[PDB]
Write a protein that binds this ligand. Structure first.
Ligand SMILES: CCCCCCC/C=C/CCCCCC(=O)OC[C@@H](O)CO
Ligand SMILES: CCCCCCC/C=C\CCCCCC(=O)OC[C@@H](O)CO
Ligand SMILES: CCCCCCC/C=C\CCCCCC(=O)OC[C@@H](O)CO
Ligand SMILES: CCCCCCC/C=C\CCCCCC(=O)OC[C@@H](O)CO
Ligand SMILES: CCCCCCC/C=C\CCCCCC(=O)OC[C@@H](O)CO
Ligand SMILES: CCCCCCC/C=C\CCCCCC(=O)OC[C@@H](O)CO
Ligand SMILES: CCCCCCC/C=C\CCCCCC(=O)OC[C@@H](O)CO
Ligand SMILES: CCCCCCC/C=C\CCCCCC(=O)OC[C@@H](O)CO
Ligand SMILES: CCCCCCC/C=C\CCCCCC(=O)OC[C@@H](O)CO
Ligand SMILES: CCCCCCC/C=C\CCCCCC(=O)OC[C@@H](O)CO
Ligand SMILES: CCCCCCC/C=C\CCCCCC(=O)OC[C@@H](O)CO
Ligand SMILES: CCCCCCC/C=C\CCCCCC(=O)OC[C@@H](O)CO
Ligand SMILES: CCCCCCC/C=C\CCCCCC(=O)OC[C@@H](O)CO
Ligand SMILES: CCCCCCC/C=C\CCCCCC(=O)OC[C@@H](O)CO
Ligand SMILES: CCCCCCC/C=C\CCCCCC(=O)OC[C@@H](O)CO
Ligand SMILES: CCCCCCC/C=C\CCCCCC(=O)OC[C@@H](O)CO
Ligand SMILES: CCCCCCC/C=C\CCCCCC(=O)OC[C@@H](O)CO
Ligand SMILES: CCCCCCC/C=C\CCCCCC(=O)OC[C@@H](O)CO
Ligand SMILES: CCCCCCC/C=C\CCCCCC(=O)OC[C@@H](O)CO
Ligand SMILES: CCCCCCC/C=C\CCCCCC(=O)OC[C@@H](O)CO
Ligand SMILES: CCCCCCC/C=C\CCCCCC(=O)OC[C@@H](O)CO
Ligand SMILES: N[C@@H](Cc1ccccc1)C(=O)O
Length: 448
């Protein structure tokens, strides 16, 4: 009977939904940094480019931090399917804001909306993929890999389309294309959802019991009150610049996993919990490097590469393109190597080494040719090829979302150090350290 690549037909609906959401997001991010440079150039937005680069990073960090609680809100309060729909609506509006005839003023509002929207939609659409299968079903792992392919397909075509559009018709038109993308996603999700998805997920699957509401309400209130108290104090002492607020967001994001580990520490498994701290750190650093591709490598693409024959934002398509191209080989590998099954601990270690190699590679063109000229595009092609090899190896969801969020929070401080004069040193040292720490994990691997 009829399937979607051997899978339940509902997967097709979820496939397209997340593909288009990812289209809207990565299409936006492929030109967002350049947009801020533009606003800076016209004098409309008073920050340095270092700060603009910092904003791209903490933006990404908040988006995934939002996703750490999205599953909770859906499962306990509003339902997974409404979470996805209304999350999509918030994302679309966020994009519409940037298409409207405003400048810097629209930036904050657009970002907030998308942070909130993605937090609702992203974990829950992935959760919905699991709902197509029973606990028992074998196909479950194949389904998610297809889902991941869709994620990268959307991520792949968006820079091409949106980038071309910005150069031809301008930023507002381009941003509107991103909005249209999310809209298309909503249409297919809504009508395809009604046809192909279990109505059980129109409502929360674990609703709050009567005695759970008040303590939850206390919990969120204290967290919000405390967060706001700090902002009050920050203004009192004069720590009120945008870099100061970004520093606040970095800390909060980093504090969360620290506080989590630090007091959820029977000798049976205090060790076992402590065993995964190296694997979390490894993921954090790899995602840090991978996420800099839309910031540091995006800067290198615009400034240091001679690609005068197509929009420079197209370079953002290389990351997901390599994911798709690698899928065939890695599919073969996991089938073919039945015995091998290398450990998650060294998978993380090797993946980190590739990411560190990808940066060491980028140190070479500046070392060889100097930094005042322009080099071949294949340097970036080579850099993406290396880092994506790591990703294939690396591939709770909250914890996954957390790892990425922490990496991007780290980037928000690191990417400010990147500039023309720093270029080689930047790449050589953050590249080298990643290889070393990757190898350090190779010592403590089964000392675990
Ligand atoms: C999606 C981005 C893929 C980038 C792949 C680029 C592969 C091409 C590398 C050769 C570029 C060297 C110089 C560029 C070029 O051929 O045209 C420029 C020159 O003809 C000016 O008239
Ligand atoms: C207007 C602000 C936009 C919202 C920013 C995103 C939300 C920020 C902080 C809430 C995250 C709370 C983290 C607690 C949590 O359960 O997630 C981590 C959990 O997996 C621990 O392992
Ligand atoms: C419509 C208003 C938009 C903002 C509302 C949605 C903001 C996100 C969450 C609101 C508080 C939910 C509490 C999240 C939480 O308790 O995390 C649970 C944690 O244990 C994760 O497993
Ligand atoms: C700016 C846009 C404002 C909102 C426009 C869309 C609102 C119109 C009707 C509300 C539809 C509610 C759908 C919520 C939902 O759970 O849909 C889930 C989907 O799977 C339907 O089966
Ligand atoms: C518990 C709540 C966690 C708080 C998380 C804070 C997330 C809210 C906003 C983050 C936005 C990222 C930076 C956006 C930004 O600086 O753009 C505004 C600026 O360009 C306008 O001059
Ligand atoms: C290079 C981009 C075009 C490649 C073909 C894209 C065609 C779009 C959808 C059809 C493929 C969707 C399923 C993807 C897929 O079969 O992945 C294979 C592997 O991941 C098995 O899970
Ligand atoms: C379906 C409703 C949500 C989806 C978005 C629909 C709106 C998207 C495009 C409609 C036209 C956008 C306006 C484009 C625009 O005016 O910017 C270009 C112009 O301002 C620059 O000179
Ligand atoms: C100026 C640009 C337009 C600003 C307002 C845009 C609002 C237009 C459409 C919102 C999209 C609604 C979500 C699409 C959808 O599938 O809902 C259909 C469902 O409600 C049918 O009952
Ligand atoms: C912070 C943004 C304001 C929007 C409200 C977010 C509320 C976040 C946390 C408090 C959750 C308590 C309300 C839960 C609720 O609606 O109960 C419904 C049902 O489960 C009662 O049994
Ligand atoms: C969930 C907490 C809600 C508290 C409402 C107030 C939180 C406001 C902002 C959250 C952090 C973003 C700070 C970015 C910002 O406002 O930039 C300020 C900048 O204009 C200084 O010149
Ligand atoms: C939960 C108890 C609260 C304890 C204090 C919470 C954390 C204390 C301070 C947060 C640091 C805020 C960011 C620091 C900052 O503003 O940087 C200043 C510097 O950039 C000058 O603009
Ligand atoms: C007793 C609690 C465990 C031991 C304390 C561990 C400290 C917990 C959280 C610290 C947050 C990490 C610092 C954030 C950070 O590195 O950013 C630095 C920068 O943003 C400051 O301007
Ligand atoms: C799959 C293997 C790919 C290997 C790519 C990485 C190659 C390993 C190391 C690259 C060396 C970069 C160091 C650059 C350097 O020496 O700095 C030069 C500096 O003195 C001039 O400013
Ligand atoms: C996992 C498999 C990875 C194998 C990749 C092997 C990588 C080999 C060399 C990478 C370093 C790049 C060499 C630098 C280079 O080619 O510059 C010379 C070029 O400018 C010629 O004019
Ligand atoms: C498996 C590695 C493939 C080959 C990668 C070898 C990378 C090592 C060095 C790259 C050459 C660096 C450029 C030459 C260089 O920096 O000379 C020093 C010069 O800056 C002094 O003025
Ligand atoms: C599927 C590939 C995985 C391994 C990729 C490793 C590639 C490492 C280096 C290749 C790119 C660096 C050399 C690029 C290069 O040759 O510069 C272009 C040269 O023609 C100067 O114009
Ligand atoms: C044959 C099928 C398996 C393919 C194995 C993957 C091949 C590994 C690396 C390919 C990247 C090319 C190496 C980069 C390179 O040598 O550039 C040299 C360039 O400077 C020549 O002018
Ligand atoms: C278990 C949680 C993992 C935490 C991993 C994060 C590592 C801890 C702190 C990172 C702080 C990085 C600060 C780097 C720095 O200050 O330099 C950049 C600064 O110049 C920005 O202008
Ligand atoms: C156990 C010894 C460490 C083994 C790590 C293996 C990493 C492979 C190649 C690393 C090449 C180092 C590149 C030279 C370097 O980093 O100098 C920094 C210089 O570029 C300053 O800008
Ligand atoms: C153990 C977890 C490590 C996570 C944080 C790793 C990065 C933290 C700090 C590195 C930046 C501190 C300053 C180092 C530095 O000078 O690098 C910049 C330099 O390469 C540019 O000239
Ligand atoms: C400067 C020389 C550059 C080349 C250095 C790269 C190779 C150097 C060290 C890699 C081997 C580290 C030893 C890993 C090891 O076997 O430790 C034991 C571990 O397997 C048990 O978990
Ligand atoms: N490239 C990934 C980034 C990511 C990693 C982990 C969690 C969430 C997002 C994606 O678009 O899905």
């Amino acid at each position: 009977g009829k399937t979607f690549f051997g899978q339940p037909l509902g997967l097709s609906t979820l496939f397209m939904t997340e593909m288009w959401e990812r289209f809207s997001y990565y299409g936006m991010r492929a030109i967002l940094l350049y947009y801020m440079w533009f606003l800076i150039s016209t004098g409309d937005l008073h920050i340095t480019r270092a700060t603009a680069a910092s904003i791209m990073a903490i933006y990404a960090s908040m988006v995934y931090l939002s996703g750490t609680i999205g599953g909770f809100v859906a499962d306990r309060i509003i339902g997974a399917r409404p979470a996805v729909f209304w999350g999509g609506v918030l994302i679309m509006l966020g994009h519409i804001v940037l298409a409207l005839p405003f400048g810097a003023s629209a930036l904050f509002g657009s970002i907030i909306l998308i942070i909130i929207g993605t937090g609702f939609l992203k974990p829950n659409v992935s959760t919905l993929v699991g709902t197509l299968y029973d606990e028992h079903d074998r196909r479950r792992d194949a389904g998610f890999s297809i889902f991941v392919f869709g994620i990268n397909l959307g991520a792949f075509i968006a820079p091409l389309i949106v980038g071309a559009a910005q150069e031809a018709a301008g930023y507002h038109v381009a941003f509107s294309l991103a909005a249209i993308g999310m809209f298309i996603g909503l249409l297919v999700y809504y009508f395809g959802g009604k046809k192909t998805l279990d109505p059980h997920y129109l409502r929360p699957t674990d609703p709050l019991a009567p005695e759970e509401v008040k303590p939850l309400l206390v919990k969120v209130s204290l967290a919000v009150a405390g967060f706001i108290a700090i902002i009050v104090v920050m203004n009192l002492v004069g720590w009120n610049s945008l870099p100061a607020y970004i520093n606040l967001l970095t800390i909060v994001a980093i504090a969360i996993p620290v506080f989590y580990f630090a007091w959820m520490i029977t000798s049976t498994e205090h060790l076992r919990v402590v065993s995964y701290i190296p694997l979390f750190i490894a993921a954090v650093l790899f995602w840090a490097i991978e996420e800099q591709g839309s910031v540091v490598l995006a800067t290198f693409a615009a400034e240091r590469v001679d690609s005068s024959w197509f929009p420079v934002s197209w370079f953002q398509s290389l990351n997901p393109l390599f994911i798709m191209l690698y899928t065939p080989f890695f599919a073969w590998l996991w089938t073919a190597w039945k015995k091998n099954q290398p450990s998650s601990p060294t998978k993380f270690a090797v993946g980190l080494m590739f990411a560190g190699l990808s940066f060491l590679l980028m140190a070479i063109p500046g070392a060889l040719y100097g930094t005042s000229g322009k080099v071949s595009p294949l340097w970036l092609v080579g850099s993406w090829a290396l880092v994506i090899l790591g990703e294939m190896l690396i591939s709770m969801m909250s914890m996954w979302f957390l790892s990425s969020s922490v990496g991007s929070a780290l980037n928000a401080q690191l990417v400010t150090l990147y500039n023309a004069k720093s270029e080689v040193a930047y790449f050589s040292y953050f590249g080298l350290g990643s290889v070393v720490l990757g190898i350090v994990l190779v010592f403590l691997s089964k000392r675990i």
